[PDB]
Amino acid sequence: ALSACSPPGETASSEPGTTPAIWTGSPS
Amino acid sequence: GVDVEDVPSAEWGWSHMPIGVMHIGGLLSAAFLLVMMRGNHVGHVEDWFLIGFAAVIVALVGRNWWLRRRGWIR
Amino acid sequence: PTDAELAEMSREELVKLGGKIDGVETIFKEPRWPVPGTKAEKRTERLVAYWLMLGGLSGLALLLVFLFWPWEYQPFGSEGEFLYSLATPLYGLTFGLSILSIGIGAVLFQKKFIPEEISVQDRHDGRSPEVHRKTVAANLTDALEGSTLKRRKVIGLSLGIGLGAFGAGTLVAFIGGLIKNPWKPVVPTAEGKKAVLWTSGWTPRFKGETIYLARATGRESPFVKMRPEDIDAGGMETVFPWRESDGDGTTVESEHKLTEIAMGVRNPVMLIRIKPADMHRVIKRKGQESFNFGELFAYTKVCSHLGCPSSLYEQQTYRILCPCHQSQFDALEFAKPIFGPAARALAQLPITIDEDGYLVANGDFVEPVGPAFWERK
Amino acid sequence: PFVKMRPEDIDAGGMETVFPWRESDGDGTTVESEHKLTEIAMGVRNPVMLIR
Ligand SMILES: CCCCCCCCCCCCCCCC(=O)O[C@H](COC(=O)CCCCCCC[C@@H](C)CCCCCCCCC)COP(=O)(O)O[C@H]1[C@H](O)[C@H](O)[C@@H](O)[C@@H](O)[C@@H]1O
Numbered sequence A: 001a002l003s004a005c006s007p008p009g010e011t012a013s014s015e016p017g018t019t020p021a022i023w024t025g026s027p028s
Numbered sequence B: 001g002v003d004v005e006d007v008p009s010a011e012w013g014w015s016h017m018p019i020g021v022m023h024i025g026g027l028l029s030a031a032f033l034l035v036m037m038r039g040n041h042v043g044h045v046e047d048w049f050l051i052g053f054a055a056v057i058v059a060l061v062g063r064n065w066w067l068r069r070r071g072w073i074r
Numbered sequence C: 001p002t003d004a005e006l007a008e009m010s011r012e013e014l015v016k017l018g019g020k021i022d023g024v025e026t027i028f029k030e031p032r033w034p035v036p037g038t039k040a041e042k043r044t045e046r047l048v049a050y051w052l053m054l055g056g057l058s059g060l061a062l063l064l065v066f067l068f069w070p071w072e073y074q075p076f077g078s079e080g081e082f083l084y085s086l087a088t089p090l091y092g093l094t095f096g097l098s099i100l101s102i103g104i105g106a107v108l109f110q111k112k113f114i115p116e117e118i119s120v121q122d123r124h125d126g127r128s129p130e131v132h133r134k135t136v137a138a139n140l141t142d143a144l145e146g147s148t149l150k151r152r153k154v155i156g157l158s159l160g161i162g163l164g165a166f167g168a169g170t171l172v173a174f175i176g177g178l179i180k181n182p183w184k185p186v187v188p189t190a191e192g193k194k195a196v197l198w199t200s201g202w203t204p205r206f207k208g209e210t211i212y213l214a215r216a217t218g219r220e221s222p223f224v225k226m227r228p229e230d231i232d233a234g235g236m237e238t239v240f241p242w243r244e245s246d247g248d249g250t251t252v253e254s255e256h257k258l259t260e261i262a263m264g265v266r267n268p269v270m271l272i273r274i275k276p277a278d279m280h281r282v283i284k285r286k287g288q289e290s291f292n293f294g295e296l297f298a299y300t301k302v303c304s305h306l307g308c309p310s311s312l313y314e315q316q317t318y319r320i321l322c323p324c325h326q327s328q329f330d331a332l333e334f335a336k337p338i339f340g341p342a343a344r345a346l347a348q349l350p351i352t353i354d355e356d357g358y359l360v361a362n363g364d365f366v367e368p369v370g371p372a373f374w375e376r377k
Numbered sequence D: 001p002f003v004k005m006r007p008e009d010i011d012a013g014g015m016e017t018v019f020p021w022r023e024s025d026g027d028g029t030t031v032e033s034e035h036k037l038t039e040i041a042m043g044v045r046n047p048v049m050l051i052r
């Protein structure tokens, strides 16, 4: 019965990020 | 830790719990209710419910301790 | 008592003597019907008889119903489904009624005809008499002292060493077949061989592998590619990692691969199209600002608490809910757990479209997916 | 796992274990095909000694 800790790698951001580029797949 | 006048069948079985156990139990229960306010929830109605119940428990423990400290309650 | 006077004891006297030998005194025992020839005795006898006879007739009913009732399953909404539905309740009724009636008859016979008694037995518990305790202690001590093992320390030390070593070796050779390293690299990946818990079916395997988000049609070809316009806003989809080289379920190896991707515990993905009127409310996670393709977000369908499928999408609150323990994650805030016992956000899968437009995964999960463990983070 | 035969395949003094194969059983690529071929090969009264 003790306290809580937030996950060290679960922060939020403010950058909106770029739209994903169209995908192309290598033959193999 | 009790008398026949308080617990008639005291000789027959375990019939007394030291008041320290109850006092620290109340304090720990209040601390648990308070510490449950840290976590994941947007709303704050539950925080007020926890605060109210912790306040009631602390008030009960404080009154009982004060009355045993002054002599009225034994 | 001698044989001659044992020959001349009545049965009651012999019962008294036998009980007295064992330490038991029956201080009360009286027949249930002292007054002969009453109607009440006849009534009670017939009551016990009726209960036993009901048990017999119910056992007969069990035999008959089991042998002759129509028991085979009948399809939905057809004739004979009522008789099929009654099949098993009739077995239960007949069997339970028969044995319960027999038990009731036995109880009534005990209460009404077997004479009421009050016997008293002496416990003779606690410590044994000193003769027994001393003799048994002397026998044990004499065994240990005549063995002479005490005054031979080399033999005792060798015996302890040998027995402990054999026990340790046997225990190790027993448990050792079950011990498996969870971190042995066994899963191929576009970055070598990796442990199972670090990988799922979304992990690319040859550095540019096209992994399609395929819906489960639940049918030959249970998975099919899908397009972004196949999800209306506020709609939810369960997609799986399906590649071209997995097949369409016709060939047996194709079915094996499709089964192995449908049974992957970390495979299912929840794909949700946010309504544009709410896309301003989206808060994005650091390092995942570019994982959505417009209005379509993709998260893991595995709860971060204990691995149940958090598969309840409430669109008007954008809340992902896990029914196993009532965790709530906010789909507008990178699936951050807003309620319940979950403390970690759901992983977000990067998605985009290919040249044809079919939705594909734009990489791998940027973290382990399921419930946490020691070696995570 | 199952292919047809001709009287010239087996030779005088040879022996062959043959199984009843219909032309709707197939060759085992599809799942129903492999189930049917397994049923053929795991039927206790199916195999036949063919001797020339
Ligand atoms: C009362 C118990 C006291 C004795 C316990 C038994 C002794 C423990 C060690 C076992 C002796 C070693 C035997 C082989 C173990 C070994 O050397 O494993 C290696 C890596 O071990 C190590 O470094 C050391 C192992 C560290 C132990 C970790 C402790 C966790 C335990 C406590 C939890 C298990 C509880 C078991 C309960 C049973 C549940 C079921 C009822 C790598 O495994 P892996 O590369 O996957 O290869 C696999 C073959 O090893 C393996 O036989 C197998 O047969 C192959 O299939 C292959 O997978």
Ligand code: FES
Pocket (backbone or CB within 6 Å): C303, C304, C305, C306, C307, C308, C309, C310, C322, C323, C324, C325, C326, C327, C340, C341, C342
């Ligand atoms: S597994 Fe989802 S809340 Fe427990």
